[PDB]
Structure formats: structure tokens, C-alpha cells
Amino acid sequence: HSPAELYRAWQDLRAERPQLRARDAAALLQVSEGELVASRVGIDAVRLRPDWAALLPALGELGPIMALTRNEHCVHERKGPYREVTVSANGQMGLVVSPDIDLRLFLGGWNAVFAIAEETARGTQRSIQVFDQQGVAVHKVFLAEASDVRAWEPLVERLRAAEQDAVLALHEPRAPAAALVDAQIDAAALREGWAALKDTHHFHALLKKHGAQRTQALRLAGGEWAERLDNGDLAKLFEAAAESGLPIMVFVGNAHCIQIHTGPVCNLKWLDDWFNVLDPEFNLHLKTTGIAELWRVRKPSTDGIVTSWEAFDPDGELIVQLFGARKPGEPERDDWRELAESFKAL
Numbered sequence: 237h238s239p240a241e242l243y244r245a246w247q248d249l250r251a252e253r254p255q256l257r258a259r260d261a262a263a264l265l266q267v268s269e270g271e272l273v274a275s276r277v278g279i280d281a282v283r284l285r286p287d288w289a290a291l292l293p294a295l296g297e298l299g300p301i302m303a304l305t306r307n308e309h310c311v312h313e314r315k316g317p318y319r320e321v322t323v324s325a326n327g328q329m330g331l332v333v334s335p336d337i338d339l340r341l342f343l344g345g346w347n348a349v350f351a352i353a354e355e356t357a358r359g360t361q362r363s364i365q366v367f368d369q370q371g372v373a374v375h376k377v378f379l380a381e382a383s384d385v386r387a388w389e390p391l392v393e394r395l396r397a398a399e400q401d402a403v404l405a406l407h408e409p410r411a412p413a414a415a416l417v418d419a420q421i422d423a424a425a426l427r428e429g430w431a432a433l434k435d436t437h438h439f440h441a442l443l444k445k446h447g448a449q450r451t452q453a454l455r456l457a458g459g460e461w462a463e464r465l466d467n468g469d470l471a472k473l474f475e476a477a478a479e480s481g482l483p484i485m486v487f488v489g490n491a492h493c494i495q496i497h498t499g500p501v502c503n504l505k506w507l508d509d510w511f512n513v514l515d516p517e518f519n520l521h522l523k524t525t526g527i528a529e530l531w532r533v534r535k536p537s538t539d540g541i542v543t544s545w546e547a548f549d550p551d552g553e554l555i556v557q558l559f560g561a562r563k564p565g566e567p568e569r570d571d572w573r574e575l576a577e578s579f580k581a582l
């Protein structure tokens with residue numbers, strides 16, 4: 237097929253199935269979302285340069301936006317101004333640090349970026365959308381009610397790519413080391429290192445060190461460090477936290493982007509298999525059925541023990557993580573720890 241052909245095929249599908257979102261439609265059309273979006277260029281999308289160092293700070297020009305980051309089973313939507321942005325010297329790491337938009341950006345796999353200005357009945361819905369080497373969405377930022385609409389066009393023109401294009405280059409997915417079996421992991425060393433952890437940020441390196449998958453290490457850590465929970469407990473913890481006003485942290489990401497909410501959750505709702513947070517500045521959409529394992533995890537650090545809940549899919553990938561709200565230098569709060577431990581292990 238061609239990009240003109242793809243665009244047409246998609247519009248035909250959406251006419252048939254207006255509930256279908258871009259990501260769903262792309263799958264039905266047997267292409268990546270990135271490809272689908274590129275089929276839009278010259279119609280209602282403009283391809284931008286992948287110049288993250290200029291683009292990311294510039295989004296701050298737009299005022300309050302909505303940032304959307306998801307994986308297969310969980311969608312995180314947070315509202316606020318896109319600041320404060322810092323991008324590393326080597327241009328491979330980005331941060332957005334603020335009480336609202338709070339992001340960790342791993343720019344290396346970021347491949348293509350488009351500015352979309354989509355006709356609505358009456359207005360136009362504008363978004364910046366980023367895609368990875370495989371065409372899978374990385375991160376999106378949506379203009380909303382309160383955005384500075386006049387920043388839009390100058391931003392697009394400044395970042396507009398020379399070759400507008402509608403094809404999109406994609407790379408074949410890169411090496412998966414085969415997992416070791418549990419019996420091949422040095423469990424004592426891993427536990428020793430676990431006990432020695434000084435900052436929750438060092439966890440990743442610890443896994444790399446012993447060659448263990450994250451779920452695998454939890455399994456081998458022992459009950460004092462990690463315990464499996466009934467999968468249905470996660471929604472219940474949200475419900476209990478809603479009940480008390482406890483400020484929590486909710487981490488949701490994919491291989492290339494992590495988005496964080498800090499604060500309480502208040503308004504919660506089920507719709508079918510979806511468990512939802514539905515607050516004015518924060519929406520969360522969790523497909524509970526996609527959760528294969530749920531762990532309570534405890535990690536030592538310089539600020540003391542940090543307790544979190546970590547939900548995984550069938551592939552061993554993290555859906556969402558919960559912590560208590562905390563500043564580096566402060567220990568976690570008792571109310572959080574009490575709630576996190578209140579639930580019975582399997």
C-alpha cells in the first residue's frame with residue numbers, strides 16, 4: 237500500500253468504527269501508529285525535526301497542556317505547563333520537573349515527531365506526537381482549553397522538517413538477550429546488593445549486574461524485600477488512598493518515556509475492565525485485566541526504606557508503579573507505608 241492509500245483506508249475504517257483510536261486503527265490496518273500519522277502529512281500533520289533540545293523547551297511556549305504517556309495497559313494523562321525542561325549535554329536524556337508535568341525522557345529511541353492540527357466540528361485539536369524506532373507512540377502533548385494557541389504556528393514553522401514526507405523510516409527491533417532461568421541467577425549476590433542499595437535510582441544497575449529480569453529479581457529477593465499480591469488489590473489501594481487523601485506517586489511509562497503524578501487521587505471509577513482516576517488535572521486509565529503480577533517491593537536507600545507496588549504484564553514489563561509522595565532527603569511517609577503494607581501477600 238501507499239501513504240495516500242493508508243490515509244484513505246484509515247478514514248474508511250474510522251467511518252465504520254468511530255470509537256477506534258489511532259493506535260487501534262493502525263493495528264487493524266496492520267501498520268504502526270507512526271506510519272499512520274505520517275500518512276497524515278500534507279493533510280493535517282506536519283513533520284517536525286527530531287531536535288529534542290530545541291523542541292522540548294519550546295513546548296513551554298504553549299502554556300498549560302495535557303501530556304499523554306502510556307504503555308499497552310495503562311494511560312497516564314497529566315495537565316500543566318511543559319516545564320521545567322532540561323536536556324543532557326549528549327542530548328540523550330530529558331527531564332521535565334514540576335509539581336504537575338513530571339517526566340523522564342529517554343531520547344535515544346525517539347525517532348519521529350509530528351505536529352497535528354486536526355479539524356473538529358468547530359475548532360481544531362492540536363498535538364505534538366512522538367514515535368519510536370518501531371513506529372510505536374512514545375509520548376504526546378495535547379493543546380487544551382488553556383493553551384496559548386498563538387504559540388502553535390511559530391513553533392511548528394521553526395521546527396518543521398525540510399523533507400515533509402509521509403513514509404517514515406523504521407528499524408528492526410533490537411536484541412533481546414534471552415532471559416536466564418531463575419537457577420542461573422546468583423541469588424545471594426543479588427540479595428546482598430539489594431540490602432546494600434543506596435538510592436532507588438540504582439536499582440536498574442543492580443539488575444543489569446546480575447543479569448536478572450525485574451520480576452525475576454522480585455521472585456528471588458525473598459519476602460522481606462518483595463511479596464506478590466492479589467492482582468485485584470491495586471484498585472483497592474487506589475480506593476483506600478482516595479478515601480484518605482494520601483498524596484501518592486504514580487509512575488507510568490514505556491521504554492522511552494516515564495510520566496509521573498504526585499499528589500492525591502480523589503475521583504475514581506470503574507468502566508468494564510478499566511479502572512480510572514478522573515480528577516481535574518490528572519486522569520489515569522488502567523486495564524486491570526492486563527495485569528499479570530502485582531508486587532509489594534521494599535528497597536533500602538540513603539533516605540531509608542522505600543516501599544512501592546509494581547504491576548507487570550505477561551511480558552514482564554511494568555504497567556504502573558506506586559510510591560508515597562516524598563522529596564529526596566525525606567523518608568517515606570508513615571501513612572503510605574501503612575497502606576502499602578496493609579494488604580495481605582499471596
Ligand code: HEM
Nearest residue numbers: 331333340436437439487494535537542544559562563564
Ligand atoms: C530531578 C530530580 C528527580 C527527582 C526529584 C526524582 C524523584 C523521585 C522520587 C521521589 C522517586 C520515588 C521515591 C524514591 O524512590 O526515593 C523516584 C523514583 C524514580 N525516578 Fe526519579 N527523580 C528525579 C530524577 C530522575 C531521573 C533523572 C531519572 C532518570 C530515569 C529518574 C527515574 C526514576 C525511576 C525509574 C524511579 C522509580 C524507581 C524504582 O524503581 O524504585 N528520576 N524519583
